[PDB]
Symmetry: C2
Subunit: 367 residues, 2 copies
């Protein structure tokens, strides 16, 4: 029999200078457990890699360094745009294999986000805490840890896809014959979760033929919501700026408003602070602000460094990811999203959002 | 050979107390020509019917009364909600057949708009001037008149569909066996225009299997725009209020903004004046207002009585209708939309919009 929730438990970074408290496994504790128990390999994938920026981050790096010296195969995937620290990392850990990834050499827009650890096809972390000293120590993050081998193995398959886009000679990033020959496998989708847990993936041109596009799963859940929608992301604006020109993409923005206006769903949005240099965020805010007076919409903003990407629907579905609900991410960026419908696990996530909602770092939107 | 533009010419109501001028056929002149030349029938369809409210409207009614007395079959279709004047109309013209229509007895939301005349399968008017004294004399309207029999005949087929929803015993509005047995025919669609002209229809549950849904044609044109989008409607808000609760529907609203932000299309919106009792129009305005500073979007408002429903795309496509670009209309209401890709006819419509844009009755949106 498979255990309910697939042995998943929440993981978060609660910095000392912030009022967030919990009894959950800290990110620092989590990464320490993965290294300590590792016997074969440790695979890590995040956009940036800069462990030496904080005290706890550097301790994780030394534990990882000690593991690589004891015979553990350590592979760290980072996007080619987090390449600055690469020389510093290799000089500190000459036995760890660092690989720069470019999942989009056709248009140079798609970025690798990860954001996960996996080891021995048994243990894994997935969430929004990059392999940086900030995400381990000083920045609020949220993730999930499971020591269930069937689930961790399915996460390792996501690592196989990303590693194929290394910037070296014939690869899935430089040739089309080696990219179309990539088995982009997955054992569990939304159609067949494992103990109520399943992964969704992105972007669409890396799905293969069996993986679920995170865009479709997220939107379907938002459209199927019957009572509540709680979201803690960085921004829920329908417009994002890729390099020079702006990009309009209201797919998620509409599914939220549609739930509030057409179906009377109670919605609480905990997003980043708006800025005046981009006035277009104010209009999007004033549009969301006015829907709070008769529709069951509510908006609070935070200014702290916070990587949390959390979605909870009707206390029956929880979505923890590393991407933000916007067009640039959900159409170009490469990430894997944690999904669970386990009642007990969703309950623990609802407890997290309630805490964050009434935190001193969450102020009601005023314009 | 078929004539380019299908012998279509623009028709508008330019009230004396407004600064609009043109050499086009006035609505009053148009309705007079249809009656004067009629030899077999005159079919009229609009939401309301109240010709006696103005001087010119009453003159049209007397001409129509004189026609019905000379043996012309006169049928006037009005929605069952414009039923107040029905007794007054029948007492003035006992030989005209007035028929109340209910195109939606399942949910009692869909309304008959028309909005057109057709006679002898030869001449027709289509536009936004209802059979009311206001639309004939004192309210700004815009429409098209053609004496091309193949085009007028295709418009009469739209009248056959609407007449079937009379509120009397077994009909397409009271039974399902008589509604599914309705040949909802059309001779010309967007796939095969006649001289560059074709009709689109609404709602979807009255399309049959050959007619084009106006919703899809309008959105496709807005998405295919490469240079300019000019619109003169009553409102382009993504939210409308049906009876008690509100209804969110941003399909057209998004296709316009997407054209401006993603494709740099120059857009000019001439819409009705926003109100403070519905603050949600202000937020939609402030969202459109801020997109005017870097994107090629522009918004002006009018307070005059104006039924004009005009869309022009890239000076290659013109869309004149009686419905407004919102969710309530394009998903429930029964109307027929004039579409033309004739360069000369689109040119005359562009001249109309340029006039209206710089009219004294069009003020730039300020919030």
């Amino acid at each position: 029999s498979v255990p309910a929730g697939a042995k998943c438990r929440l993981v978060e970074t609660l910095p000392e200078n912030m009022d967030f408290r919990s009894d959950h496994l800290t990110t620092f504790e989590c990464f320490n457990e993965i290294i300590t128990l590792a016997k074969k390999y440790i695979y890590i994938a995040s956009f940036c890699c800069n462990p030496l920026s904080t005290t706890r981050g550097a301790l994780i790096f030394d534990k990882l360094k000690e593991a690589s010296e004891k015979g553990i195969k350590i592979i760290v995937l980072l996007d080619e745009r987090g390449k600055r620290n690469l020389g510093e990392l290799q000089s500190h850990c000459p036995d760890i294999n660092f690989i720069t990834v470019n999942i989009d050499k056709k248009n140079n827009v798609g970025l690798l986000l990860g954001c996960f650890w996996v080891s021995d096809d048994e243990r894994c972390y997935v969430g929004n805490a990059s392999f940086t000293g900030g995400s381990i120590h000083t920045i609020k993050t949220l993730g999930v840890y499971s020591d269930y081998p069937p689930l961790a193995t399915d996460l390792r398959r996501r690592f196989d896809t990303f590693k194929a886009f290394n910037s070296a000679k014939n690869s899935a990033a430089n040739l089309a014959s080696a990219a179309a020959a990539l088995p982009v496998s997955t054992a569990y989708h939304i159609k067949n979760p494992i103990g109520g847990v399943f992964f969704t993936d992105s972007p669409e041109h890396l799905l293969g033929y069996s993986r679920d596009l995170d865009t479709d799963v997220v939107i379907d859940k938002l459209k199927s919501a019957k009572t509540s929608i709680d979201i803690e992301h960085l921004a829920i604006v329908p417009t994002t700026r890729v390099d020079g020109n702006s990009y309009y993409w209201p797919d998620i923005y509409n599914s939220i408003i549609e739930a509030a206006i057409n179906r009377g769903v109670k919605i609480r949005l905990l997003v980043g602070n708006w800025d005046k240099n981009d006035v277009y965020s104010m209009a999007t805010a004033r549009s969301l602000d006015e829907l709070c007076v008769q529709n069951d919409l509510s908006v609070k903003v935070f200014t702290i460094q916070n990587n949390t990407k959390l979605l909870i629907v009707d206390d029956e579905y929880v979505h923890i990811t590393s991407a933000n609900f916007d067009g640039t991410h959900y159409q170009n960026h490469g990430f894997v999203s944690f999904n669970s419908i386990d009642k007990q696990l969703v309950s623990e996530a609802k407890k997290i959002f309630e805490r964050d909602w009434v935190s001193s770092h969450s102020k009601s939107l005023k314009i």
